[PDB]
Every structure is written in C-alpha cells, then in structure tokens.
Design a protein around this motif. Sequence first.
Motif, PDB file in Angstrom:
ATOM      1  N   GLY A  69     -23.822   4.103  24.589  1.00  0.00           N
ATOM      2  CA  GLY A  69     -24.224   5.441  25.013  1.00  0.00           C
ATOM      3  C   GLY A  69     -24.605   6.358  23.868  1.00  0.00           C
ATOM      4  O   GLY A  69     -24.553   5.973  22.687  1.00  0.00           O
ATOM      5  N   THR A  70     -25.010   7.562  24.248  1.00  0.00           N
ATOM      6  CA  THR A  70     -25.233   8.669  23.326  1.00  0.00           C
ATOM      7  C   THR A  70     -24.084   9.617  23.629  1.00  0.00           C
ATOM      8  O   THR A  70     -23.830   9.941  24.793  1.00  0.00           O
ATOM      9  N   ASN A  71     -23.390  10.060  22.579  1.00  0.00           N
ATOM     10  CA  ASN A  71     -22.074  10.681  22.740  1.00  0.00           C
ATOM     11  C   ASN A  71     -22.019  12.073  22.181  1.00  0.00           C
ATOM     12  O   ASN A  71     -22.570  12.335  21.118  1.00  0.00           O
ATOM     13  N   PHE A  72     -21.337  12.951  22.909  1.00  0.00           N
ATOM     14  CA  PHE A  72     -21.096  14.327  22.468  1.00  0.00           C
ATOM     15  C   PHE A  72     -19.619  14.552  22.319  1.00  0.00           C
ATOM     16  O   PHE A  72     -18.857  14.304  23.242  1.00  0.00           O
ATOM     17  N   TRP A  73     -19.221  15.034  21.150  1.00  0.00           N
ATOM     18  CA  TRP A  73     -17.837  15.422  20.904  1.00  0.00           C
ATOM     19  C   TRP A  73     -17.781  16.933  20.827  1.00  0.00           C
ATOM     20  O   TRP A  73     -18.606  17.541  20.156  1.00  0.00           O
ATOM     21  N   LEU A  74     -16.780  17.534  21.457  1.00  0.00           N
ATOM     22  CA  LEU A  74     -16.554  18.964  21.296  1.00  0.00           C
ATOM     23  C   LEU A  74     -15.358  19.171  20.365  1.00  0.00           C
ATOM     24  O   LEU A  74     -14.340  18.513  20.524  1.00  0.00           O
ATOM     25  N   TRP A  75     -15.454  20.125  19.439  1.00  0.00           N
ATOM     26  CA  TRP A  75     -14.280  20.497  18.645  1.00  0.00           C
ATOM     27  C   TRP A  75     -14.121  22.007  18.729  1.00  0.00           C
ATOM     28  O   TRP A  75     -15.037  22.724  18.358  1.00  0.00           O
ATOM     29  N   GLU A  76     -12.967  22.466  19.234  1.00  0.00           N
ATOM     30  CA  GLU A  76     -12.721  23.899  19.455  1.00  0.00           C
ATOM     31  C   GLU A  76     -11.866  24.455  18.334  1.00  0.00           C
ATOM     32  O   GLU A  76     -10.722  24.029  18.160  1.00  0.00           O
ATOM     33  N   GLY A  77     -12.427  25.398  17.585  1.00  0.00           N
ATOM     34  CA  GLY A  77     -11.673  26.086  16.521  1.00  0.00           C
ATOM     35  C   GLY A  77     -11.758  25.370  15.189  1.00  0.00           C
ATOM     36  O   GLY A  77     -12.705  24.612  14.926  1.00  0.00           O
ATOM     37  N   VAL A  78     -10.789  25.625  14.317  1.00  0.00           N
ATOM     38  CA  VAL A  78     -10.769  24.939  13.027  1.00  0.00           C
ATOM     39  C   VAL A  78      -9.601  23.979  13.070  1.00  0.00           C
ATOM     40  O   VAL A  78      -9.798  22.754  13.181  1.00  0.00           O
ATOM     41  N   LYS A  79      -8.389  24.543  13.030  1.00  0.00           N
ATOM     42  CA  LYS A  79      -7.123  23.828  13.273  1.00  0.00           C
ATOM     43  C   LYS A  79      -6.642  22.932  12.129  1.00  0.00           C
ATOM     44  O   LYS A  79      -5.490  23.061  11.686  1.00  0.00           O
ATOM     45  N   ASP A  80      -7.490  22.009  11.682  1.00  0.00           N
ATOM     46  CA  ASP A  80      -7.182  21.205  10.492  1.00  0.00           C
ATOM     47  C   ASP A  80      -8.462  20.824   9.782  1.00  0.00           C
ATOM     48  O   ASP A  80      -9.281  20.085  10.320  1.00  0.00           O
TER      49      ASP A  80
END
Length: 245
Positions: free
Chosen positions: A179-190
Amino acid sequence: SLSWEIEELDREIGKIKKHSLILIHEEDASSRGKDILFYILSRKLKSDNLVGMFSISYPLQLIIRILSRFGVDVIKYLENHRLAIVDTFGSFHGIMPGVWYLEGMLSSETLPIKYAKAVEDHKKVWMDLNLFEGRELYGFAISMSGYLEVFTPEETLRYLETSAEVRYGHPAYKKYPRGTNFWLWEGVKDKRVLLSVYRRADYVLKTRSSLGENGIKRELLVIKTPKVRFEYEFKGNEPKLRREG
C-alpha cells in the motif's frame, strides 16, 4: 502516481509516488492537520479504494463519529470489505465485521508480528474477493505518537526498527500488493522518536498555527519529498490551501 486529494498539493509538489510512506506531523492541535488527514482518508474511501487503518490513539466509536462528519459511514465500508480496522486502542485498553483485535501480550517486541498477521489476514480476504483489481490500497496510522502512551521512547525506537525488519520479509508485504501509507504524529512529545519517523517517511508535511493579531493562521510546510509552504483554512471539512511566497 496517486493524488493527494488536495489540488494545490498535486499542482505544487506533484502526485504521490506509489507505495510511499507519508508523515503528517501535526505540530500543534490548533493547526487541525489531523483534519487534513481525515479529509484525505474520506476521499480515498469515497473513491472506492481499499483502506486499512491502524486505530491507535482513539476509541473506535470516536473514529466512527469523526468519519461521519466527513460523510463516511464506517459500518458500511467495513461490511462491504473496503475498510479494514486494526483496533489497537481497544486492544490496549481492553474494550464488528472488518475490525481486528490484537490478543495476548502487546509489547514493543510482540506487536510487529501481531500486526503482520492481521494485515496478512485482511489482504487474504481482499485477494480472495479479487478486490485489489482496479483499486489502490492505502494505510493510515492514527496516530503513531500514540505509542508513547504505552511504550517508553527507547521501546518505541526499537519497535519502529523491529517493525521495519518484520515488513522486509513477512508474507503480508511480500506475497500481496503493498500500500501507500499515511502516518499521523500529533505534537512533539519525544524529539528522538520524531527524528526516526521523519527519517523513515518518504514525504513529511508539517502543520502548525501562528497566532495573529487578527486571528489564527494555519500553515502546511513541505519538509521532505523524494525530489514549499501553504496557508490553509477550511470550508466545512474541505481544506483550502494557498501557496505562500
């Protein structure tokens, strides 16, 4: 190549190279970068593609409500075999056709192979029904920042690498269409974990807000491509982008 489902992106940075990993880094919550990703997801579903979601950060009932805002009735797409959900959130927190639950110990060490098995199982259904034909497969992980609620940064960094190792050889990725994939990352955090996900992604788009005297300004920055800044707002649920000078 595949559409961003946002004309300004297709025009200014070009369409997506098939099989890419795209990171949407929502740097702050006010930017609503998450809503841009849900918009894209809703468009891929409405265009009759196959979609797998790793639902990590939110209760399933909340995902259903969110998607209903976008004119997507999750149950219908599940029952018609267009959408597969791995309910990672419910699996971790101890709480439907097309919805997979991860059983047993869920650690930074066990999770990669457990995902691979779920993915293989979804893809076997799609292949049996011949549903890949004339369709694209997309994955969405909402959101990869959620792992920091259950894993240490060190564990998450190892997890990201073990995941890549499993994907290199597992039948889920080698014996079926990818597939073609999307990752979401919310904020900074580390910052260290964020460094790893930036490196792993082929595209990185970062959204952020600026407080102006006259209101909030929302910006999307094209941080990384295989080969640019936009201001945006929303008309209903539709993101409207303007390339900045």
